[PDB]
Design an enzyme around this catalytic site. Structure first.
Site, short mmCIF file in Angstrom:
data_model
loop_
_atom_site.label_atom_id
_atom_site.label_comp_id
_atom_site.label_asym_id
_atom_site.label_seq_id
_atom_site.Cartn_x
_atom_site.Cartn_y
_atom_site.Cartn_z
N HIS A 244 0.83 -1.24 0.00
CA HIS A 244 0.00 0.00 0.00
C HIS A 244 0.85 1.27 0.00
O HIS A 244 0.64 2.17 0.83
CB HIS A 244 -1.02 -0.04 1.13
CG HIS A 244 -2.15 -0.99 0.88
ND1 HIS A 244 -2.27 -2.16 1.57
CD2 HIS A 244 -3.22 -0.92 0.04
CE1 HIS A 244 -3.36 -2.79 1.17
NE2 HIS A 244 -3.96 -2.04 0.22
N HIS B 164 1.83 1.46 -5.67
CA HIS B 164 0.41 1.03 -5.78
C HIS B 164 -0.46 2.19 -6.29
O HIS B 164 -1.28 1.98 -7.19
CB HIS B 164 -0.09 0.45 -4.48
CG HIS B 164 -1.56 0.18 -4.48
ND1 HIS B 164 -2.10 -0.87 -5.18
CD2 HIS B 164 -2.58 0.77 -3.84
CE1 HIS B 164 -3.41 -0.92 -4.95
NE2 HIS B 164 -3.72 0.05 -4.11
N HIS C 5 -5.97 7.26 -3.50
CA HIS C 5 -7.04 6.42 -2.89
C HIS C 5 -6.53 5.73 -1.62
O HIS C 5 -7.37 5.21 -0.85
CB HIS C 5 -7.67 5.44 -3.88
CG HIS C 5 -6.81 4.24 -4.10
ND1 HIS C 5 -5.66 4.30 -4.83
CD2 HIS C 5 -6.92 2.98 -3.67
CE1 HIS C 5 -5.09 3.10 -4.84
NE2 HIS C 5 -5.85 2.27 -4.14
N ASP C 6 -5.21 5.65 -1.40
CA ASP C 6 -4.66 4.91 -0.22
C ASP C 6 -3.67 5.82 0.56
O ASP C 6 -2.86 5.29 1.35
CB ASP C 6 -3.97 3.63 -0.65
CG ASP C 6 -4.85 2.40 -0.72
OD1 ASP C 6 -5.89 2.32 0.00
OD2 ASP C 6 -4.48 1.51 -1.49
N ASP D 83 -8.10 -0.92 -8.48
CA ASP D 83 -7.48 -1.26 -7.19
C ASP D 83 -7.01 -2.71 -7.17
O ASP D 83 -5.99 -2.96 -6.52
CB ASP D 83 -8.47 -0.99 -6.08
CG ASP D 83 -7.80 -0.89 -4.75
OD1 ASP D 83 -6.57 -0.54 -4.71
OD2 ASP D 83 -8.49 -1.18 -3.80
N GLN E 73 -5.51 -17.80 -3.17
CA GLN E 73 -5.60 -17.01 -4.44
C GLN E 73 -6.77 -17.47 -5.30
O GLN E 73 -7.53 -16.58 -5.79
CB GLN E 73 -4.26 -17.03 -5.18
CG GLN E 73 -3.20 -16.20 -4.45
CD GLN E 73 -3.53 -14.73 -4.46
OE1 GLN E 73 -3.74 -14.13 -5.51
NE2 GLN E 73 -3.70 -14.16 -3.27
C1 LIG Z 1 -3.82 -10.81 -5.17
C2 LIG Z 1 -4.70 -9.90 -4.36
C3 LIG Z 1 -5.19 -8.58 -4.64
C4 LIG Z 1 -4.94 -7.71 -5.77
F1 LIG Z 1 -5.99 -7.72 -6.59
F2 LIG Z 1 -4.89 -6.48 -5.25
F3 LIG Z 1 -3.76 -8.02 -6.32
N1 LIG Z 1 -5.92 -8.16 -3.58
C5 LIG Z 1 -5.92 -9.18 -2.66
C6 LIG Z 1 -6.60 -9.35 -1.39
C7 LIG Z 1 -6.41 -10.56 -0.69
C8 LIG Z 1 -5.58 -11.64 -1.22
C9 LIG Z 1 -5.39 -12.88 -0.41
C10 LIG Z 1 -6.44 -13.86 -0.95
C11 LIG Z 1 -6.56 -14.94 0.09
N2 LIG Z 1 -5.54 -15.64 0.56
C12 LIG Z 1 -6.02 -16.52 1.48
C13 LIG Z 1 -5.11 -17.50 2.26
C14 LIG Z 1 -3.78 -17.54 2.02
C15 LIG Z 1 -2.91 -18.42 2.72
C16 LIG Z 1 -3.45 -19.26 3.68
C17 LIG Z 1 -4.82 -19.25 3.91
C18 LIG Z 1 -5.66 -18.40 3.21
C19 LIG Z 1 -7.36 -16.33 1.59
N3 LIG Z 1 -7.71 -15.37 0.68
C20 LIG Z 1 -8.98 -14.79 0.39
N4 LIG Z 1 -4.94 -11.51 -2.48
N5 LIG Z 1 -5.14 -10.27 -3.15
MG LIG Z 2 -7.45 1.07 0.22
ZN LIG Z 3 -5.58 0.42 -3.03
#
Ligand SMILES: Cc1c(C(F)(F)F)nc2ccc(CCc3nc(-c4ccccc4)cn3C)nn12
Ligand SMILES: [Mg+2]
Ligand SMILES: [Zn+2]
EC number: 3.1.4.17
Length: 313
Positions: free
Chosen positions: A68, A72, A106-107, A217, A269
């Site tokens: 962040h 970004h 935005h952040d 985002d 993921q």
């Molecule tokens: C790539 C990405 C982006 C973007 F679009 F910004 F790149 N935004 C995000 C927001 C969150 C995540 C993490 C996604 C996620 N990992 C787990 C997890 C991982 C290890 C062990 C147990 C559970 C659960 N869950 C929902 N990736 N992410």
């Molecule tokens: Mg934000």
């Molecule tokens: Zn953001």
């Protein structure tokens, strides 16, 4: 006034593509941002002196956290630039001005911690703003910087045009609260499918700009695989630090934030692409057909995380 910004040839061509990566040379990011304002908005949109001073104060108010951060902000603004450039005639002059600034801001002053952690820590910001805690803070930091001397990039707008652009920026920044995204996409889905979606209805524009903001985002899932994969390390470095902080307050973090459970990253993921990203770029492509390369790139990255799980990487 006759003073264009121009980029080297590979950047001049590749900045127009959705999957462009702004590169590791921090000192070129301001120039990349001005380039994008000049082509998406005009060389007349902002006074160059004021714009340059505003960009540098914005940079200064982003912190040195793993994800962040200033990189970004400029990455999210470039995605927005690509959306606006591929949808020339759909957006007002005020929208073109507001949305790149919204994205860059935005952040602002993010600490690498979620709204939930602020609430469990009992941070002052959680008492000042009971929902979308960090997002109300980011908008408040944006207004602050716009009010420093020499920083009013909107000085040439009327009183009512100024209020309209600050209202586009406010809703744009609030919309980056992912908790709000799920309901916003459902409503857009229903509106599109029942044929009620109407871009002259201001409440409909708002929703569509909200979804654009979510798409920009999340745009680290729309890059070439090596960019997507390395950014994910930055993303998890924040979440794992937040998890450590939860353990310090005596709260078992969710697995996403627990570094002891690194091994489940690939399946985490998958859930995220299926539950959040794919539906985001799908509804976005329905509403704005020329944004389809974002959905196609997202799908390619889901397919790459599927290969990680199958032990093919
Ligand atoms: C790539 C990405 C982006 C973007 F679009 F910004 F790149 N935004 C995000 C927001 C969150 C995540 C993490 C996604 C996620 N990992 C787990 C997890 C991982 C290890 C062990 C147990 C559970 C659960 N869950 C929902 N990736 N992410
Ligand atoms: Mg934000
Ligand atoms: Zn953001």
């Amino acid at each position: 006034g006759l003073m264009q910004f121009t980029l080297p040839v590979r950047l001049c061509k590749e900045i127009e593509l959705f999957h462009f990566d702004i590169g590791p040379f921090e000192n070129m990011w301001p120039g990349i941002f001005v380039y994008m304002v000049h082509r998406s908005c005009g060389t007349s949109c902002f006074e160059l002196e004021k714009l340059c001073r505003f960009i540098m104060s914005v940079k200064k108010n982003y912190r040195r956290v793993p994800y962040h951060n200033w990189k970004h902000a400029v990455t999210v603004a470039h995605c927005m630039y690509a959306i606006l450039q591929n949808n020339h005639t759909l957006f007002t002059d005020l929208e073109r001005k507001g949305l790149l600034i919204a994205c860059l801001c935005h952040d602002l002053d993010h600490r690498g911690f979620s709204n939930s952690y602020l609430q469990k820590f009992d941070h002052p910001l959680a008492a000042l703003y009971s929902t979308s805690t960090m997002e109300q803070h980011h908008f408040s930091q944006t207004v602050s910087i716009l009010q420093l001397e020499g920083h009013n990039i909107f000085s040439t707008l009327s009183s009512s045009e100024y209020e309209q652009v600050l209202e586009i920026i406010r809703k744009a920044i609030i919309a980056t609260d992912l908790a709000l995204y799920f309901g916003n996409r459902k409503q857009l889905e229903e509106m599109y499918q029942t044929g009620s979606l109407n871009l002259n209805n201001q409440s409909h524009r708002d929703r569509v700009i909200g979804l654009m903001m979510t798409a920009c985002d999340l745009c680290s899932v729309t890059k070439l695989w090596p960019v997507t994969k390395l950014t994910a390390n930055d993303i998890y470095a924040e979440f794992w630090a937040e998890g450590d902080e939860m353990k310090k307050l005596g709260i078992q973090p969710i697995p996403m934030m627990d570094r002891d459970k690194k091994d489940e990253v690939p399946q985490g993921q998958l859930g995220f692409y299926n539950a959040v990203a794919i539906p985001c770029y799908t509804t976005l492509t329905q509403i704005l057909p020329p944004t389809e390369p974002l959905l196609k790139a997202c799908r390619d990255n889901l397919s790459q995380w599927e290969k990680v799980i199958r032990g093919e990487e």
